[PDB]
Amino acid sequence: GRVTNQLQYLHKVVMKALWKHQFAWPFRQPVDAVKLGLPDYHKIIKQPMDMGTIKRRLENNYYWAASECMQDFNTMFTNCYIYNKPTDDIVLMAQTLEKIFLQKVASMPQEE
Amino acid sequence: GRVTNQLQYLHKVVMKALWKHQFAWPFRQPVDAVKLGLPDYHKIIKQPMDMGTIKRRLENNYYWAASECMQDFNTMFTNCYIYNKPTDDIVLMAQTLEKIFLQKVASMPQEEQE
């Protein structure tokens, strides 16, 4: 399975930078609502998403197009903005990670 | 201040498409917190952003790089997700517009030049 240049880039440049970032640890595995004491999490967030899942998908050739992986990154960050209070530190963490995401995606190679 | 091929794409292809979208009307001008009756809007959102502002920036060569413009679109969508209740229609409208935005960024020409 050959892998588009865009998908290679998302794996080698985007996920690379985000996975090791110092603000990444809340996002590396699925949100565990019991562990975190968040009984309404799954009532507000209908499509949970996390970097561990995206990283796995990147490693296993799940995605057909880059836009599909980009949407998973975007759902992960958006889940955080919608669920959490504006003043939660997690929001600031997400915004910082998202900025890196967008900055890297601006230089992603062309498709095809 | 700069004109590039990607900034031209963001202006003529991405924004033109978003602007005309049937869910765009809340986002074409600044949020008017008096009109809408939202006295806490500016206490929660510290960087208001709207498509009007972004379009004008693109017409005046305010941006140096496409990434700077992409960051303003992100701020506009994120403002919506942070301020609004999860169940508000506006959140759904922002998500639908943001998906187009990311789909179109994935086809942006990669010769970031001029």
Side-chain angles (χ1 to χ4, degrees):
Chain A
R2 277 281 277 99
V3 191
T4 64
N5 284 344
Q6 291 194 133
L7 281 175
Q8 282 176 54
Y9 181 92
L10 286 167
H11 185 33
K12 271 76 139 41
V13 174
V14 184
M15 176 58 83
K16 191 103 161 161
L18 294 184
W19 182 252
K20 62 180 191 166
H21 198 281
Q22 63 186 140
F23 292 168
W25 65 266
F27 305 100
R28 284 190 190 118
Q29 57 293 124
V31 166
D32 181 345
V34 182
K35 181 175 169 207
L36 299 171
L38 273 20
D40 63 334
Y41 185 80
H42 295 286
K43 293 179 186 197
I44 300 324
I45 301 308
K46 298 315 201 185
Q47 190 186 169
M49 184 55 50
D50 73 289
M51 297 184 197
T53 297
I54 300 169
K55 187 161 90 78
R56 190 167 59 245
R57 291 181 179 182
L58 284 172
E59 288 172 358
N60 288 330
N61 308 324
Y62 177 88
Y63 298 118
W64 298 351
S67 59
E68 196 187 338
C69 171
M70 294 168 58
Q71 195 59 227
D72 278 350
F73 275 107
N74 183 68
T75 295
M76 177 180 70
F77 292 126
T78 292
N79 285 351
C80 173
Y81 305 144
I82 285 177
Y83 177 73
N84 288 282
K85 302 186 271 204
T87 51
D88 288 337
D89 292 353
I90 198 184
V91 168
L92 288 17
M93 293 163 88
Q95 288 179 122
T96 302
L97 298 167
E98 187 171 43
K99 285 161 169 54
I100 293 158
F101 171 75
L102 289 173
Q103 284 279 159
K104 308 293 201 184
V105 158
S107 293
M108 173 176 54
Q110 277 178 49
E111 15 165 53
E112 206 221 281
Chain B
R2 221 165 155 228
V3 199
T4 68
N5 59 156
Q6 295 181 150
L7 285 167
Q8 198 173 72
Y9 179 86
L10 286 182
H11 188 7
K12 272 46 165 60
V13 167
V14 182
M15 179 58 90
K16 189 172 177 169
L18 299 178
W19 189 272
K20 301 175 161 348
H21 194 291
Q22 58 180 138
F23 297 157
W25 61 273
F27 305 102
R28 291 183 187 129
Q29 54 296 123
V31 169
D32 186 325
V34 178
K35 266 251 296 159
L36 280 298
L38 272 28
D40 60 340
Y41 182 78
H42 296 276
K43 317 258 198 219
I44 294 162
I45 295 310
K46 295 317 210 168
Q47 196 191 167
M49 192 43 64
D50 71 283
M51 300 177 176
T53 295
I54 293 177
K55 188 161 76 82
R56 178 171 66 248
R57 290 170 172 194
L58 289 159
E59 300 171 338
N60 291 333
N61 303 317
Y62 171 86
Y63 303 117
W64 172 270
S67 64
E68 306 178 341
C69 175
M70 294 164 56
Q71 234 45 267
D72 287 350
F73 273 104
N74 184 72
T75 297
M76 175 181 62
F77 293 132
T78 293
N79 289 344
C80 179
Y81 305 141
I82 294 163
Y83 178 72
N84 288 279
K85 295 179 187 87
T87 47
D88 282 341
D89 289 354
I90 193 145
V91 168
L92 268 23
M93 298 171 67
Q95 293 174 122
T96 292
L97 298 159
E98 184 170 31
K99 305 180 174 11
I100 292 166
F101 166 71
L102 294 170
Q103 276 164 181
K104 299 291 201 174
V105 166
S107 308
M108 186 160 59
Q110 281 303 331
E111 333 296 293
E112 175 69 316
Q113 71 181 302
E114 283 180 81

